[PDB]
Amino acid sequence: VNSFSGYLKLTDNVYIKNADIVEEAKKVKPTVVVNAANVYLKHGGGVAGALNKATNNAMQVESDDYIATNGPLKVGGSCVLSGHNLAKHCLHVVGPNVNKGEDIQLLKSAYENFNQHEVLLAPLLSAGIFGADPIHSLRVCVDTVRTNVYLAVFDKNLYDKLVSSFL
Numbered sequence: 024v025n026s027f028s029g030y031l032k033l034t035d036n037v038y039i040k041n042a043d044i045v046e047e048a049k050k051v052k053p054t055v056v057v058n059a060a061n062v063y064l065k066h067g068g069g070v071a072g073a074l075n076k077a078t079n080n081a082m083q084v085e086s087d088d089y090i091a092t093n094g095p096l097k098v099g100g101s102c103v104l105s106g107h108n109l110a111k112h113c114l115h116v117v118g119p120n121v122n123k124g125e126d127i128q129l130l131k132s133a134y135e136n137f138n139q140h141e142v143l144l145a146p147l148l149s150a151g152i153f154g155a156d157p158i159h160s161l162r163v164c165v166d167t168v169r170t171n172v173y174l175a176v177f178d179k180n181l182y183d184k185l186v187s188s189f190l
């Protein structure tokens with residue numbers, strides 16, 4: 024039993040809700056919140072910009088030190104950093120950005136990072152400003168993640184489309 028509330032159950036392990044991931048994280052304080060990161064951990068917009076703003080830029084400060092030490096992530100890769108005031112940990116995961124010409128096949132590799140964590144609050148990878156089809160992202164999530172994932176979909180219209188079309 025966990026403290027996630029109001030989610031629709033899609034499969035044994037995948038749940039979904041129309042919610043602002045920032046507000047969800049502040050309420051639940053999950054062990055792991057997933058960020059829709061880029062390889063530079065530059066948290067400018069989309070989910071990343073919103074999470075970082077909610078940390079008063081502490082996420083960006085920590086991320087800049089991470090990059091200075093380790094260099095950029097790989098597309099499809101991840102790193103674990105602090106969750107600041109939002110969660111215990113933040114799993115920064117880089118899905119392919121279609122608006123940069125990146126290989127959508129890397130979406131499965133991106134979701135595989137979730138399997139290293141028993142429970143996560145997460146967005147749909149590569150959706151939104153990353154330019155991929157969110158229906159596809161949900162399908163890859165369900166077919167790749169085996170741990171317990173609570174998906175927050177900000178756009179209510181998109182949420183209804185995702186539920187109604189789910190196979």
Ligand SMILES: Cn1cc(C[C@@H](CO)Nc2ncnc3[nH]ccc23)cn1
Pocket residue numbers: 042043044045059069070073146147148149150151152175176177178181
């Ligand atoms: C129509 N539309 C698609 C998306 C993409 C989605 C991630 O896939 N973004 C977010 N998801 C959850 N919480 C969030 N907070 C801030 C952004 C955000 C947003 N709008």
Ligand SMILES: [Cl-]
Pocket residue numbers: 068069070150151152153
């Ligand atoms: Cl977005």
